[PDB]
Design goal:
The structure is a homodimer. Chain A is an alpha/beta fold. Chain A contains 19 helices and eight strands. Chain A has two domains: 284 residues, Alpha-Beta Barrel (TIM Barrel); 167 residues, no CATH class. The first copy, chain A, has an eight-stranded parallel β-barrel with strand order 1-2-3-4-5-6-7-8, surrounded by six helices. In chain A, helix 5 crosses helix 19 and helix 8 runs parallel beside helix 9. The longest helix of chain A is centred in the last third of the chain and has 21 residues. The first copy, chain A, starts with 5 loop residues before the first strand and ends with a helix. The interface between A and B is large, with 45 and 41 residues. The structure holds zinc ion (ZN) (2 copies). One zinc ion binds next to loops of chain A.
Chain lengths: 451, 453
Amino acid sequence: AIKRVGVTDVVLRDAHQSLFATRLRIDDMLPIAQQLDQIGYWSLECWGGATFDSCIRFLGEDPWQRLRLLKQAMPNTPLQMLLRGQNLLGYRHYADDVVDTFVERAVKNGMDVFRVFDAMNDVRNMQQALQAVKKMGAHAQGTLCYTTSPVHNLQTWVDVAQQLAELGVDSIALKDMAGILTPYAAEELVSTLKKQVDVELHLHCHSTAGLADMTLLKAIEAGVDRVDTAISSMSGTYGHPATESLVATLQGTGYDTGLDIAKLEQIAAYFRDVRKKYHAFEGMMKGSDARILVAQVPGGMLTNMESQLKQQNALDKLDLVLEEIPRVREELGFLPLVTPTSQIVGTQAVINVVLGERYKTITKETSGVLKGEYGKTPAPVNTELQARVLAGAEAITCRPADLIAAEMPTLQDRVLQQAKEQHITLAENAIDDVLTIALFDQVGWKFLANR
Amino acid sequence: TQAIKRVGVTDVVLRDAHQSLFATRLRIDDMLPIAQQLDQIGYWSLECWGGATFDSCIRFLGEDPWQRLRLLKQAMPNTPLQMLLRGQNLLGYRHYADDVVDTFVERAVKNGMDVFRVFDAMNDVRNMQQALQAVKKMGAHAQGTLCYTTSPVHNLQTWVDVAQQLAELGVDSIALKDMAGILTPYAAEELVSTLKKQVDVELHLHCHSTAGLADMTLLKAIEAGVDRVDTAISSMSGTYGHPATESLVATLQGTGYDTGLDIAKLEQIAAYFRDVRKKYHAFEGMMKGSDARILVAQVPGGMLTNMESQLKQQNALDKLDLVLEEIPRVREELGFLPLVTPTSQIVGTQAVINVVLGERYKTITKETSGVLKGEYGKTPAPVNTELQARVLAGAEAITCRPADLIAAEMPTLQDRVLQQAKEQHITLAENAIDDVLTIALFDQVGWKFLANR
Ligand SMILES: [Zn+2]
Ligand SMILES: [Zn+2]
């Protein structure tokens, strides 16, 4: 049943993260904030993802002060973030109290909509954060990270989507970080999900392999409720389809977003000038990258792998590494090649090729996947390698966060003391700084000392 | 609905891609080492000539355009070669005499041209007629062209009419050509549906990515039954150019439209062009993403760029909105001529003048006069009366095909060229008529090149 399609703009988060290393500063945002807020977007994505790490590591911005500045700039349009479930914006699984504290504080500082994902689509890692988002009156969007494999099919996707609907989520996001979701695969998967699961659907696709404009359009024809787009001047390549373009397309159809091309083009003009300033951080790809089309290796993965193959010399072994990825991926139970898992498969595959021996040196990360430390892989991992890193302990088959003790009081302890010992002034809400240290440790301490 | 079948693909990497993306500078020496791989793909055709390449060859690259073609045909024996040809204007600056048109086409074919996408900026079929007819006579493929536009006098029946007019000439296929990137996906669905149902010819789509619509437009056109699309090898695709070849191939793989093209083979060619495109960074434009200004009111990017140059040179630039408000009014008063090169700069320039002077048509340009006089051909709708009558004398407007009034040029050009060539110690080609064509089309620029070849 055809109805108005809702739009979330990613310009203030994933566009810049994807386009120029997450370097967009808050003072480049605020002058165009009132105009963004008057558009009628379903939500504006403007936090989480790599913006926390960028804020504290490169920009000299407090991520929480940024949030409050945006929310004051933009009273009408709900703010969206991307949050990696039990990992939050950090490097490891955290205790439940850390998760709960983070959502509260994010909502207090002005956050509305929460897109909560897990790289393996193990719904258990999403549960606590979704729970707390719902508990904080906020809007919970549970996520499926799209992938392709011998063990992912319509039946598997529907049952994950169902588990999330069962958790009470407010909507479900379908996210294709690599841009590998084809238009006709999108048509089928969305249609199917709209037949089986009683939830609003919201699609996120990258333009990196050139599929994303066609994909969003085929998902809209199959009935997707919402899509993510970027402002025209901040779209394309590594990022996302243009807003105006998909706005123009749906005009005078039943899907008509009702967005104003003229009011949108003004914002695009603003960002065209802003984007020029950041030219030093732009990747080198022009058009789209067909390499990704060949074997579903995401472009960010190929980059990271080639670098490692540079810093060992022997870049001529690239083709062997490429044939190694599928082998290593199967052995680790067909985990999606999605951040930060893709780097685990890539590093290990590079090691398997360089060292001339399959699994001679096994990384801390490959081991942890096998031992169940990240959750349930889509298909059971290889037993011959698992037992070899267990020798002979048991596998973790529970939600890893069941095994980790409460952190917030012991952490709150360390932070207030060290801050005083180091003569560091903490925020008006000290807990926010405690959270920064939880997630980024020394990087967070260096930021707080310099704030 | 049209029957579902394999979509044909034309790759424009050797012509329109780099014309669009780096000032038409791609050299032959960068084309030939990938040529055998391109020929093994199974493209329906490879667009590798015409447009601005002839000019670029002689004006910037020190290449003989005829010789490029021969090298390309040599290197790519199994794939039909394709060119863009502006009807009576050939690749030149004015309407030429029929004997020149006939001579060019015969020479294009004997050098190795197989497919001729023949067009006219106004969609006046009489300007396309001689070239199409000459193409047919040579046993080559004649693709007549509709140049897409949006106007109060343009609609489905009107596009049907033009396509029908071309069908009656016996064209082998009909191209739909969106140079500006303004053809929306659903308008394309509607238009392609109507043409496939009402006119009995193969349809071939060309759309530019400039405004972000082309990927979606090509897909919706395919669903509506279009027979062929133009794409560009991925590393040579996007922004000012065209949808990516591999992206479309992957999208169609295992569907009823399955092109049957090998993605791994295509990617190899793309990895090649990625490096090559690096070398031409100097000539790249500044646009990143899509151009949403095109979407506001259908002003092509090139047209705006050119109007803003004129305004800044004047000055001023703060009269831009007024000039933008002026275009719609001028275009009507000029019979809703498509905003397509070279007719867009006719509208743009006249409009800039009207605003800068402070009086509308205080000054009428040589080109606006020509449009009012019927010297270019028939406008989609009657021009403004009596702006037309202000220009003639008043005489009566020209209502015929312009090439009816031009005297035969080839005998008097062949002699002129041959005598100037010997007196200036300039060695001509094995088939000297090709140089005579080079000079016919480009005058001084041609002479300059022949003198230094
Ligand atoms: Zn993303
Ligand atoms: Zn073109």
